[PDB]
């Protein structure tokens, strides 16, 4: 029994106050097994399709940061995205 | 001493807010109240205190009656409750920052964008004098302009002074060697990208070089309500600075600098109901990230930001960047003018050029360093020669290479320390004896 | 008519014009230069250098008249959301063939663009006399305007050099 | 020496003949008969034109002006932006009531009070009701009416309440008249005889604006928020400590603001464009539609730009900038069933017979500029008798004792 | 969209209320309002990047046109509640153009003076109708212009041609 999770879009680069595009995994896991990172409007582009720079592992969820996307392309925004867990039950 | 009474006003007078009562829609209840006398203490903590023992406030300290306090250009004494203010006499600065952006001597920010020889500041009576300015395009189009030439015509208008914009001053289509002092004015250069001008009437000029060309006029208030030019009258109300010299208050700033063309022949401009981060899509991304560390506080901005409130600064940050052909230019000359208006007010940024500007910091020579508090009375001892005749106290410090807290600067090069600096008639060397043996400074005659 | 750039670094105005200009920087490929309110401007921007034979695209900056579309290779950005192709904004049309990114307006406006190198572009006839980037002037004369303009004949290297666009970090 | 009737006080520091000089027109002109220029127009000799209260005149290339005094005028309108009688322009969101005017300045006859409410989730105030307290009469203007409280006994300073157009007016004989447009904008007239006499948020009136930001407690300060946190009526009220930004707490409301606000720097208010500078007209609209985010958001608009071109009308210029799609109006509703009478005159310049001025009765201020809907009586009643919004024959109209309309 | 939207919920709910109160009372036994009272709070709800008082009128004259349809003519707006503005296509000051808030007028144009005739009866749509003079009864559609009945265009292949 190590099914996977729903899609979580918890946050918006449009709104909230991190400054980006931050997504974890509290209220749902504790210690996942692996960690799916998508976009949200086009999402069968891969991390290194957006090109913007990020940072999406199994220990702490999905950090983006608006600071980080200057130079990149004309706009410097996160784009919109959002992440699956997988974890494990007896 | 609140006591309790029925059927008494709930409406009391407190000490800030008198004469509530004469305002009272409410009907009489029962509740701790006041005696006949006696308003509530507000802004201290007691009880029905007297009138006249009020404790007044002025952002935070709770000053007792009678303790004085000088303020901006007026001093403050705390009475019964109120302040009792009475003026102090204070200057007034015209700006001209950027390429177009006019700051009268009452306020008054507005935008121009020019091309003539225009009057920006002259005496009224026949003669006294008259300082124009060149605003002529620089960059591509016609909205991209620039500083130029500063003419200054001074000494019953038979004596011009040209500033150009390489350094490069001029008396009277001739070459002049700076220092330079006269009976009338006097023009020094401390800083080798500012020239500082004085004069006996009461006039001073702050010429900026880089990054871009700059002015900063400043008048006394014995001169107040006997100027014109696009600086304005300079009366305290700056409703009637668009007012032309033949009657009446214009309504654009175009409208009414079009008045004060030094030339006849040069066209009439006219506004410009556009910004400029809309016509640049590549450049208003630089200029959102850069400007925006005016109103950051991790920065070494936030500490204005009690005093200055960068909220305008910021506006035009982004519409000089926007707008000019060499970006970072504009972007560091309206950051110098931030933290230049900081330091008008006390607030001296020591070292803000770390992360956003330092392309020239590292490039001082050998002994001599970066400062930010560059004033005339740090010269050589060649002005300690004369220590009395030239030091122009009054100006703004400046940001530019020079030495540190000792060892003052010698004829040449690096900056020797006090003992063997020179002996200035020709600066001598430190081996020489006239009877005065070469010293320290000053010399043993 | 059409403007089209292909190949290693050719080039053909909207009045023929072929011509061979190696930049590399980023460069005005048309523009509305009618100087009351400009429509549109398309920005091209050559790579890094590929290699010796192709020559690729690296991005396509689009402007028209409210909003600005921003082409990759694998994505479109528009107002910096990207965006699921086919888009279907009434005055905007963008999609995505295994081939092409077309991007239809109704401005009289037309880019159709593989993801490497051949890019063209399709204006009206409402824009003659107006248009100014590197794909010439659109008055419909045989190279009358664009490399002899005050009697001074231009080489297409210094007519391209005369195209580019300054960016506020990088020389 | 090539003189040219704009350089005359410049000074000639750096085509027409000796004698003889250009005047921008055209030829050369002797200096006697030299034109004047006001706001980009070109008037010539012995012209006249008005400026508020005065008369001028184009006499040698100068204009030679009249001294009378006129009225002045606070303003008072959208998420919280002031105009005082002596034109300082600022910003300011306090949530209490806020002393407008008043002559109790450190005794006294007349108070005007703001009260300052939430409109928005941004944390932006704007003004919700007005409270007139003449002597011991105490008006108060709420709910789209006024209601007359506290009514004294037998000293009853004389006013009078009208309405004109879609605003309402409160007018005193003692001088002071106050304008509403029955949701957020104010705008309060003095007599001449206020001079340097007033204080509260809308300064003090002495024609010298380096002083409108002294507070309650006599002291000049050079913040915002210092002068405007010392007029709140009640001192529980809390303290503004910042003030907010309404495009940047609400990203996504941005892009419809500036595209519906930049009617008024465009081609329709073009003749406005050289005697009303309207750029801080645009970014009160953009702040006060960036801000009505819990609903309805163009009334937020309509006011805006509504406030810009009053500020036309009042200068010379008419613009008729409505439309069925941005910012309809509907004057039918009042006609009788199709008998077409109310038509909207979009800048107000119509002088008709009421039942007021037909027995004398005028006022003191011109108030010809106010936007709305206008009667235009037939002539078997051309006589319109305002408190019923009939048109009536000139005998059966009504009483007007103690502001009441008896029929 | 209420859920989404917790602070715009009171206006809409409120604004929205119009629909069951007694202003439409006249339609309460004829048409549901139900169903169009949830429309429009969630169109009102929703409406949150700009213009709501446009997705407000909508939804109150989707329930109105109704009621015209089934025999009930409802007379809802003022000049504070969704207002129209019919005088501004107006000859400057001659009016012709009055708002008929349910349409129910038959007169001549000049397509059904020669002969052309629909298929339905479209005779229930609000908006502003002309009711063109006596000495030139016969309203061309497609200038907005009260003409005399000879001087009004040609109609081929859909295009007006004077
Ligand atoms: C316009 O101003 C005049 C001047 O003050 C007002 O006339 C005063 O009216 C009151 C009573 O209505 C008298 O007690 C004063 O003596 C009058 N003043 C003078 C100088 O005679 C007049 O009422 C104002 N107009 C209106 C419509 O109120
Ligand atoms: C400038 O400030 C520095 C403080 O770091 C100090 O050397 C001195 O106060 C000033 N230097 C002068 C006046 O030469
Ligand atoms: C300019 O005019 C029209 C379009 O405006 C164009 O067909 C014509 O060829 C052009 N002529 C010249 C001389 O540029
Ligand atoms: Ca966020
Ligand atoms: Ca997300
Ligand atoms: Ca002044
Ligand atoms: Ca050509
Ligand atoms: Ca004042």
């Known amino acids: 029994c190590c099914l996977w999770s729903d899609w979580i879009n918890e946050d918006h680069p449009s709104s909230g106050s991190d400054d980006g595009d931050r997504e974890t995994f509290d209220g749902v896991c504790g210690a996942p097994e692996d960690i799916e990172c998508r976009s949200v409007k086009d999402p069968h582009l891969s991390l290194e399709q957006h090109g913007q720079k990020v940072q999406c592992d199994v220990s702490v969820g999905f950090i983006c940061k608006n600071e980080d996307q200057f130079g990149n392309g004309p706009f410097g925004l996160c784009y919109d995205y959002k992440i699956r867990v997988n974890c494990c039950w007896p | 001493n609140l006591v309790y009474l029925e059927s008494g006003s709930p409406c009391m007078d407190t000490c800030s807010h008198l004469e509530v009562s004469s305002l009272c829609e409410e009907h009489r209840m029962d509740g701790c109240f006041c005696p006949e006398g006696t308003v509530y203490d507000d802004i201290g903590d007691s009880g029905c205190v007297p009138v006249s023992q009020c404790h007044c406030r002025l952002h935070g300290h709770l000053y007792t009656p009678g303790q004085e306090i000088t303020n901006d250009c007026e001093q403050c004494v705390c009475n019964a409750g109120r302040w009792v203010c009475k003026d102090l006499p204070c200057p007034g600065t015209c700006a001209l920052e950027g390429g177009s952006h006019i700051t009268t001597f009452d306020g008054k920010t507005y935008t121009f964008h020019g091309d003539c020889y225009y009057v920006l500041a002259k005496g009224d009576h026949n003669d006294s004098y008259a300082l124009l300015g060149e605003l002529a395009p620089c960059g591509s189009t016609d909205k991209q302009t620039c500083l130029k030439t500063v003419v200054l015509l001074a000494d019953k208008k038979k004596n011009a002074v040209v500033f150009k914009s390489d350094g490069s001053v001029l008396l009277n289509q001739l070459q002049v060697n700076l220092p330079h002092v006269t009976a009338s004015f006097s023009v020094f250069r401390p800083s080798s990208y500012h020239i500082m001008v004085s004069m006996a009437i009461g006039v001073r000029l702050q010429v900026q070089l880089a990054p871009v060309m700059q002015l900063f006029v400043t008048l006394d208030q014995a001169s107040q309500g006997q100027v014109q030019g696009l600086c304005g009258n300079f009366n305290g109300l700056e409703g009637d600075d668009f007012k032309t010299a033949s009657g009446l208050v214009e309504a654009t ?193 | 008519n059409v403007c089209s750039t292909w190949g290693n670094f050719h080039y053909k105005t909207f009045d023929g014009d072929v011509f061979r200009f190696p930049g590399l920087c980023d460069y005005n490929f048309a523009s509305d230069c009618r100087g009351s309110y400009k429509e549109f401007a398309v920005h091209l921007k050559r790579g890094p250098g590929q290699a010796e034979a192709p020559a690729g695209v690296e991005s396509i900056l689009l402007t028209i008249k409210d909003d600005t579309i921003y082409l990759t290779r694998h994505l479109a950005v528009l107002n910096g959301a990207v965006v699921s192709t086919p888009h279907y904004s009434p005055g905007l049309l963008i999609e995505k063939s295994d081939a092409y990114t077309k991007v239809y307006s109704r401005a009289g406006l037309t880019l159709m663009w593989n993801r490497e190198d051949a890019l063209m572009l399709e204006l009206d006839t409402k824009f003659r006399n107006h248009t100014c980037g590197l794909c010439g002037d659109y008055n419909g004369l045989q190279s009358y305007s664009e490399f002899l303009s005050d009697g001074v004949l231009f080489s297409p290297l210094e007519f391209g050099n005369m195209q580019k666009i300054n960016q506020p970090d990088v020389v | 020496r090539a003189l040219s009737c704009q350089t005359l006080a410049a000074g000639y520091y750096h085509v027409c003949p000796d004698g003889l000089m250009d005047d921008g027109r055209g030829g050369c002109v002797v200096e006697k008969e030299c034109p004047c220029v006001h706001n980009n127009d070109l008037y010539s000799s012995g012209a006249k034109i008005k400026v508020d209260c005065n008369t001028c005149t184009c006499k040698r290339g100068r204009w030679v002006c009249t001294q009378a005094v006129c009225h002045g005028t606070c303003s008072i309108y959208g998420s919280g932006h002031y105009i005082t009688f002596d034109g300082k322009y600022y910003d300011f969101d306090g949530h209490c009531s806020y002393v407008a005017v008043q002559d109790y300045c450190g005794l006294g006859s007349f108070s005007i009070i703001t009260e300052n409410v939430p409109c928005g989730t941004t944390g932006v105030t704007c003004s919700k009701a007005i409270k007139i307290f003449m002597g011991r009469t105490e008006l108060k203007l709420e709910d789209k009416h006024r209601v007359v409280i506290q009514r004294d006994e037998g000293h009853h300073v004389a006013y009078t309440t009208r309405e004109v157009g879609q605003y309402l007016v409160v007018e005193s004989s003692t001088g002071i008249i106050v304008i509403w447009d029955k949701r957020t904008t104010v705008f309060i007239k003095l007599a001449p005889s206020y001079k340097g006499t007033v204080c509260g948020l809308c300064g003090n009136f002495d024609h010298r604006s380096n002083n409108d930001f002294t507070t309650r407690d006599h002291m000049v300060v050079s913040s915002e928020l210092d002068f405007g946190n010392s007029w709140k009526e009640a001192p529980t009220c809390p303290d503004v400590s910042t003030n907010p930004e309404p495009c940047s707490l609400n990203p996504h409301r941005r892009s419809w603001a500036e595209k519906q606000c930049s009617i008024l720097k465009s081609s329709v208010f073009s003749i406005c464009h050289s005697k009303v500078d309207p750029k801080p007209f645009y970014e009160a609209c953009v702040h006060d539609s960036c801000s009505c985010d819990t609903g309805g958001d163009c009334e937020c608009f309509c006011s805006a730009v509504a406030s810009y071109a ?83 024959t000139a005998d059966k109209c009504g009483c007007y004792v103690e502001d009441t309309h008896y029929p």
Not at chain 2, 335 to 340: D, E, Q
Not at chain 4, 335 to 341: I, K
Not at chain 4, 342 to 368: K, L, M, Q
Request: with cysteine; aromatic share 10%.
């Open chain 2, 253 to 445: 700033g175009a409208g009414f600098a079009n008045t004060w063309k030094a030339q006849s022949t040069c066209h009439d401009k006219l506004d410009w109901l556009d910004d400029p981060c809309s016509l640049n899509i590549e450049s208003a991304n630089y200029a959102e990230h850069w400007c925006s560390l005016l109103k950051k506080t991790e920065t070494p901005f936030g500490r204005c930001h009690s005093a200055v409130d960068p909220a305008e600064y910021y506006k035009r940050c982004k519409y000089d960047t926007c707008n000019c052909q060499n970006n970072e230019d504009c972007l560091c000359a309206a950051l110098s003018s931030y933290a230049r208006a900081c330091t008008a007010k006390g607030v001296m940024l020591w070292g803000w050029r770390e992360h956003v500007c330092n392309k020239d910091v590292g490039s001082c020579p050998n002994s001599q360093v970066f400062l930010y508090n560059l004033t005339t009375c740090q010269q050589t001892c060649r002005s300690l020669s004369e220590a009395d005749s030239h030091c122009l106290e009054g100006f703004a410090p400046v940001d530019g290479c020079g030495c540190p807290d000792h060892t003052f600067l010698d004829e040449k090069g690096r900056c020797v320390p006090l003992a063997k600096c020179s002996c200035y008639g020709l600066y001598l060397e430190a081996g020489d004896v006239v009877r005065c043996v070469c010293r320290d400074g000053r010399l043993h005659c």
């Open chain 4, 310 to 392: 009053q500020e036309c009308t009042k200068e010379g210029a008419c613009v008729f900038w409505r439309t069925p799609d941005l910012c309809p109006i509907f004057c039918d509703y009042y006609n009788p069933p199709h008998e077409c009478e109310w038509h909207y005159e979009p800048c107000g310049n119509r002088s008709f017979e009421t039942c007021r001025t037909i027995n004398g009765i005028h006022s003191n201020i011109s108030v010809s500029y106010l936007e709305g809907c206008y009667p235009r009586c037939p002539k078997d009643r051309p006589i319109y008798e305002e408190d019923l919004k009939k048109c009536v």
